[PDB]
């Protein structure tokens, strides 16, 4: 019974996130969006954050440890358990984390400050999220389809 209630709570969290912030829900999804809203406190409190802040929300202990001891800061925070940074591998993971955090900052500012005529469909209420997700998936597949370095193909002699 606890599992059934937790499943319907996850469905409710998804529906309420698509109600509140359709752009960010179209970008990363309802659970990671709810984690970001939770850490920042509110939607208009998340919207006042730069993209570099939204990149490393949640990784703050490692961040301030590294900043105070002149180590190297963490590359991402809560954003790591989104969908779109999990397809990459290698340094393209950190590059996609940067780009995704910037698009999340734009989408949260749009979902927290833009007005709508109240007869506005959800497909046009999540327009910035749709456009940013399509562009960001194109940039991800370019970063993954970057070819490897050419080499000299040697014969059996060494010639």
């Amino acid at each position: 019974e606890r599992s059934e209630y937790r499943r319907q709570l996850a469905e409710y969290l998804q529906n309420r996130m698509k109600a509140i912030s359709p752009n960010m829900t179209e970008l990363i999804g309802a659970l990671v969006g709810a984690r970001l809203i939770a850490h920042s406190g509110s939607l208009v409190n998340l919207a006042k954050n730069p993209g570099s802040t939204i990149q490393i929300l949640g990784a703050e202990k490692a961040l301030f440890r590294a900043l105070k001891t002149k180590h190297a800061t963490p590359k991402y925070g809560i954003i790591y358990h989104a969908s779109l940074v999990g397809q990459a591998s290698g340094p393209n993971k950190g590059k996609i984390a940067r780009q995704l955090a910037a698009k999340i900052a734009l989408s949260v500012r749009t979902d927290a400050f833009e007005d709508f005529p109240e007869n506005a469909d959800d497909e046009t209420r999540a327009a910035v999220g749709i456009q940013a997700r399509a562009k960001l998936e194109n940039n991800l597949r370019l970063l993954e389809g970057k070819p490897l370095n050419k080499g000299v193909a040697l014969g059996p002699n060494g010639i």
Partner: peptide, 29 residues
């Protein structure tokens, strides 16, 4: 983002936004 960081840190003396932004709501914070 860098403007928001300077204004939040309080080192900023003046801040100039632009009105030709196509979604104008991305600088309203």
């Amino acid at each position: 983002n860098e403007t928001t960081k300077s204004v939040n840190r309080g080192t900023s003396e003046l801040v100039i936004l632009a009105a030709d932004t196509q979604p104008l709501s991305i600088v309203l914070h």
